[PDB]
Amino acid sequence: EQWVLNPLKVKPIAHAIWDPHFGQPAVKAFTKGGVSYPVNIATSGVYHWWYTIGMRSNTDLYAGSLFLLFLAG
Amino acid sequence: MTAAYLPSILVPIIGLIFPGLVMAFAFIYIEQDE
């Protein structure tokens, strides 16, 4: 939702990092993306694809995740 | 993050308990004869 507001400036987040081997410099170094936790920045382009096909909010990305869990079942 | 507790709860379980348990069971299954 932060990225869709400003897609050329915000760096897309793939998922967060919870790694008990990290030092505090590592935790600070990965805390980009405008959030308060370490993150991987997505290189998959899924933000640009989901933006282009209609998805606007987290609720509809989540609704898509739920629908795919149903389809997987 | 919402449900921020879940990464602390699951990542050690999925990353240590899951392999340990499935390796232990896989070891038992590959070694067993009947």
């Binding site: 987290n58 609720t59 989540y62 995740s65 739920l66 869990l69 149903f70 079942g73 | 919402t2 449900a3």
Partner: peptide, 30 residues
């Protein structure tokens, strides 16, 4: 943002998918 309840619904549906995955794997294994 996603609620903890919404995450729990996703975890319920993924558990149902896990059970169906176990059932397919046992059926394929025979």
């Amino acid at each position: 943002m996603i609620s903890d309840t919404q995450i729990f619904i996703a975890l319920i549906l993924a558990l149902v998918s896990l059970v169906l995955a176990i059932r397919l794997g046992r059926a394929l294994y025979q």
